[PDB]
Scaffold this active site. Structure first.
Site, short mmCIF file in Angstrom:
data_model
loop_
_atom_site.label_atom_id
_atom_site.label_comp_id
_atom_site.label_asym_id
_atom_site.label_seq_id
_atom_site.Cartn_x
_atom_site.Cartn_y
_atom_site.Cartn_z
N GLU A 35 0.82 -1.21 0.00
CA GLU A 35 0.00 0.00 0.00
C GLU A 35 0.85 1.26 0.00
O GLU A 35 0.50 2.22 -0.68
CB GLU A 35 -0.94 0.00 1.21
CG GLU A 35 -2.10 -0.97 1.13
CD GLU A 35 -3.14 -0.64 0.09
OE1 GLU A 35 -3.06 0.46 -0.53
OE2 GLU A 35 -4.02 -1.49 -0.13
N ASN A 46 -8.30 9.36 -4.85
CA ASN A 46 -9.25 8.52 -5.58
C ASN A 46 -10.14 9.35 -6.50
O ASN A 46 -10.36 10.54 -6.29
CB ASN A 46 -10.12 7.73 -4.60
CG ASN A 46 -9.36 6.98 -3.53
OD1 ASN A 46 -9.68 7.06 -2.33
ND2 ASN A 46 -8.35 6.24 -3.95
N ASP A 48 -13.20 9.51 -6.83
CA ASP A 48 -14.45 9.99 -6.25
C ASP A 48 -14.28 11.16 -5.29
O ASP A 48 -15.24 11.54 -4.62
CB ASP A 48 -15.16 8.85 -5.53
CG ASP A 48 -14.45 8.35 -4.29
OD1 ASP A 48 -13.33 8.83 -4.00
OD2 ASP A 48 -15.02 7.48 -3.60
N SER A 50 -12.30 11.28 -2.64
CA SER A 50 -11.69 10.86 -1.40
C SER A 50 -10.19 10.64 -1.61
O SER A 50 -9.68 10.59 -2.73
CB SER A 50 -12.33 9.58 -0.86
OG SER A 50 -12.08 8.45 -1.69
N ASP A 52 -6.70 8.39 0.13
CA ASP A 52 -6.17 7.31 0.95
C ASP A 52 -4.95 7.83 1.70
O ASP A 52 -4.05 8.42 1.10
CB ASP A 52 -5.74 6.12 0.10
CG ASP A 52 -6.84 5.80 -0.91
OD1 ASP A 52 -7.98 5.55 -0.46
OD2 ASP A 52 -6.54 5.83 -2.12
N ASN A 59 -9.07 5.25 3.61
CA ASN A 59 -9.73 6.28 2.81
C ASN A 59 -10.69 7.16 3.60
O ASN A 59 -11.25 6.81 4.62
CB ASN A 59 -10.43 5.63 1.61
CG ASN A 59 -11.75 4.99 1.90
OD1 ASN A 59 -12.72 5.65 2.30
ND2 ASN A 59 -11.83 3.68 1.68
#
Ligand SMILES: CC(=O)N[C@@H]1[C@@H](O)[C@H](O[C@@H]2O[C@H](CO)[C@@H](O)[C@H](O)[C@H]2NC(C)=O)[C@@H](CO)O[C@@H]1O
Length: 129
Positions: A35, A46, A48, A50, A52, A59
């Site tokens: 990650e 992201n 959308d 959001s 991380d 997120n």
């Protein structure tokens, strides 16, 4: 902070992740590697809206509030900035909540693709724990 592999394994062990919901410690170390490459400052946007955050790339749609994500559910009851600290306590406590969902560690896409099903015990071998 960029953690070493065994440094991180020890820190995660002390916070209760070994065999949490049936997942041995090496799963969590492998997840963090793919990650974030063990970097607590890692962030990714992201599509959308959001973001991380941190070593486990948690997120802001569901888990933490960063102030700029409309409708964040903030299920971990934390500001996302707390997930960027050198201290991994907040990230681990939130990760336990995430892993308690129906799909477990499949919530971490990099774990699913690069760790799941392999001999993850390798990720803690050679560490003093
Ligand atoms: C536990 C956690 O937060 N894991 C991250 C995933 O949630 C990330 O996946 C992305 O999640 C956002 C918010 O739900 C989705 O809009 C987006 O579709 C999803 N992306 C993918 C490829 O599934 C993931 C992104 O790399 O990072 C952590 O695994």
């Amino acid at each position: 902070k960029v953690y070493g592999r065994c440094e991180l394994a020890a820190a995660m062990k002390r916070l209760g992740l070994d065999n949490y919901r049936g997942y041995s410690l090496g799963n969590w170390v492998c997840a963090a590697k793919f990650e974030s490459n063990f970097n607590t400052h890692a962030t990714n946007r992201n599509t959308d809206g959001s973001t991380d955050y941190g070593i486990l790339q948690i997120n802001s749609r569901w888990w933490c509030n960063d102030g700029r994500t409309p409708g964040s559910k903030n299920l971990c009851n934390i500001p996302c900035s707390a997930l960027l600290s050198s201290d991994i306590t907040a990230s681990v406590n939130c990760a336990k909540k995430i892993a308690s969902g129906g799909n477990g560690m499949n919530a971490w896409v990099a774990w699913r693709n690069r760790c799941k099903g392999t001999d993850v015990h390798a990720w803690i071998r050679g560490c003093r724990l």
